[PDB]
Amino acid sequence: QMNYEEVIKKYRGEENFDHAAYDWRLHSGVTPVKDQKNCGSCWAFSSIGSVESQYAIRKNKLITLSEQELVDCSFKNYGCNGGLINNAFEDMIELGGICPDGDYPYVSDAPNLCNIDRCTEKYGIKNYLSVPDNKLKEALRFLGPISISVAVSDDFAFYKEGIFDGECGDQLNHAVMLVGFGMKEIVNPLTKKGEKHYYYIIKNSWGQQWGERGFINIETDESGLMRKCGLGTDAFIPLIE
Amino acid sequence: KVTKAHNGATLTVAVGELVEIQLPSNPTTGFAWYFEGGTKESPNESMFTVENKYFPPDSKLLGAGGTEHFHVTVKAAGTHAVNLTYMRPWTGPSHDSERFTVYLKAN
């Protein structure tokens, strides 16, 4: 139902933008890294994070929201055994939004019953938009952090710093957040000249001792059409206004 | 052959026989099964060799876990502890890590 071209017209206009670099971490767009722990709940962490970002960006409100409520209460998804990003946003509309996680804490795979009335005020969305796979940089620049799929392998678990150089998973398997893009000039030791190396910046939900304080840089190109490991094959952004 | 149901069992096996260990495993959480040190390789290649493989689920959900297969072949006579821990490799194990052990007894 929501049309990307109609939405982008509204938020971008005719405003042009640098394709090299834009990081929401520096423009009040990214809330703290969380940890899903031993629980297949990344679908909830990715989608909640993107809502958290929109409140920071559009309402100047820092709020941390309850992945646990989505885990317990989202009937379209399967809790600790997996789910879908779009399904998560659908359930948030149906549920009337989500409690702050201060009122509804994360207990991982511990048994827990859905209770949709744990707070005085829930934080909702109006709808969500699918981002076309060739518009990730524009969508990031003008709309905000995006909930995306990626195909992760065990190489991801050993990532420490820099631009990811490991193998891809066999299949899209993990929901994360696209929070920006960047570029680093590195001298080619043969040509002795600087070369531009572009990357997407992703927020994961494996805690802050993983990767670059919870984040990972993934190789892209200037246009952003380069999508390593199927990144952004599913790409959804919630809208709260 | 071997599953979580066999945790702590002793299996009688021949030198040269392949034991397939199949364990649930979700790489989307960062956890996987490891020998001590955070490796998929055998503690002692003279006693037994280990090959390893992840198999994703037929589910297309994000966060749906799969299965690790460890193919263990005993190389010398003796009773050999195969000790695995389910852990994040950057964190290492704790008191409460899930552990799997099987003993492989070859005459």
Side-chain angles (χ1 to χ4, degrees):
Chain A
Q1 272 288 31
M2 273 194 95
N3 182 279
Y4 174 86
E5 307 306 327
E6 234 50 51
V7 175
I8 207 70
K9 197 216 321 318
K10 224 74 139 30
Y11 279 86
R12 171 169 185 166
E14 58 279 71
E15 253 279 293
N16 205 336
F17 81 99
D18 192 16
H19 285 68
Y22 193 83
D23 189 346
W24 280 105
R25 297 176 304 182
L26 304 174
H27 300 283
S28 215
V30 182
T31 55
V33 171
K34 297 192 186 166
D35 198 350
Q36 69 187 85
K37 299 171 187 219
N38 184 17
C39 177
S41 60
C42 60
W43 58 273
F45 278 81
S46 174
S47 60
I48 290 289
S50 276
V51 174
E52 293 179 4
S53 290
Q54 290 296 312
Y55 277 91
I57 295 160
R58 304 303 164 179
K59 275 136 166 47
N60 211 41
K61 172 51 168 175
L62 214 195
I63 194 64
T64 62
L65 300 172
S66 182
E67 283 84 13
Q68 198 63 53
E69 175 160 12
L70 224 47
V71 158
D72 295 350
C73 293
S74 193
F75 193 82
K76 291 185 188 93
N77 294 304
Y78 295 89
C80 279
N81 308 326
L84 298 176
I85 293 155
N86 52 332
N87 276 358
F89 289 138
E90 290 288 342
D91 281 355
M92 300 184 194
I93 296 147
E94 237 151 303
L95 291 170
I98 297 295
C99 272
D101 56 8
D103 307 295
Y104 204 146
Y106 186 69
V107 299
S108 194
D109 63 352
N112 213 69
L113 294 193
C114 170
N115 187 338
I116 63 163
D117 199 32
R118 289 250 243 144
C119 60
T120 72
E121 239 145 61
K122 302 194 89 183
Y123 286 74
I125 69 173
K126 290 175 159 194
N127 208 358
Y128 66 96
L129 177 66
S130 190
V131 183
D133 66 17
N134 66 334
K135 298 297 184 212
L136 300 169
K137 281 195 174 177
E138 186 187 53
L140 267 170
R141 177 61 179 89
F142 290 107
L143 270 25
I146 318 167
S147 303
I148 57 159
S149 57
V150 72
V152 303
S153 62
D154 63 345
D155 283 339
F156 241 76
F158 294 82
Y159 170 80
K160 287 149 147 200
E161 51 174 34
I163 303 179
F164 186 53
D165 69 355
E167 280 186 291
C168 287
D170 291 348
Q171 124 191 352
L172 299 160
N173 63 4
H174 187 41
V176 297
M177 287 185 66
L178 200 57
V179 298
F181 50 97
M183 184 260 108
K184 200 163 150 228
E185 200 137 12
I186 300 171
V187 176
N188 180 322
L190 242 205
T191 75
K192 320 296 191 188
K193 294 280 188 191
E195 281 172 355
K196 291 174 185 166
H197 297 255
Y198 300 90
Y199 54 87
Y200 279 119
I201 306 151
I202 286 182
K203 181 182 153 183
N204 195 1
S205 51
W206 295 350
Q208 295 164 15
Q209 295 104 280
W210 181 79
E212 292 190 344
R213 306 232 266 159
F215 297 86
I216 177 162
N217 308 119
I218 284 176
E219 181 189 354
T220 195
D221 56 353
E222 183 184 19
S223 62
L225 295 184
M226 190 183 274
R227 288 184 315 104
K228 297 301 198 200
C229 303
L231 102 65
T233 303
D234 313 289
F236 295 101
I237 175 162
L239 290 174
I240 72 170
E241 286 183 330
Chain B
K1 237 166 293 323
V2 180
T3 61
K4 251 190 232 176
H6 303 77
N7 197 14
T10 294
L11 269 151
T12 154
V13 131
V15 173
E17 282 194 24
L18 186 291
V19 178
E20 193 176 46
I21 306 184
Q22 298 179 49
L23 290 176
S25 193
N26 194 347
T28 75
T29 67
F31 288 77
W33 297 91
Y34 294 104
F35 292 96
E36 196 188 52
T39 174
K40 307 286 200 193
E41 284 311 317
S42 172
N44 187 341
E45 206 78 343
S46 300
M47 298 302 112
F48 64 86
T49 62
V50 191
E51 233 99 316
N52 166 58
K53 248 286 212 182
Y54 178 75
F55 285 99
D58 193 356
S59 188
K60 297 317 184 145
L61 299 169
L62 305 177
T67 310
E68 283 187 71
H69 288 45
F70 291 81
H71 281 215
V72 177
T73 311
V74 181
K75 290 286 165 208
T79 305
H80 317 281
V82 23
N83 300 319
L84 298 169
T85 310
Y86 194 67
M87 72 184 173
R88 288 170 161 174
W90 72 98
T91 304
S94 41
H95 215 26
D96 294 349
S97 288
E98 196 190 342
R99 293 186 163 79
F100 178 85
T101 288
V102 67
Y103 305 96
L104 306 180
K105 184 195 297 183
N107 190 65

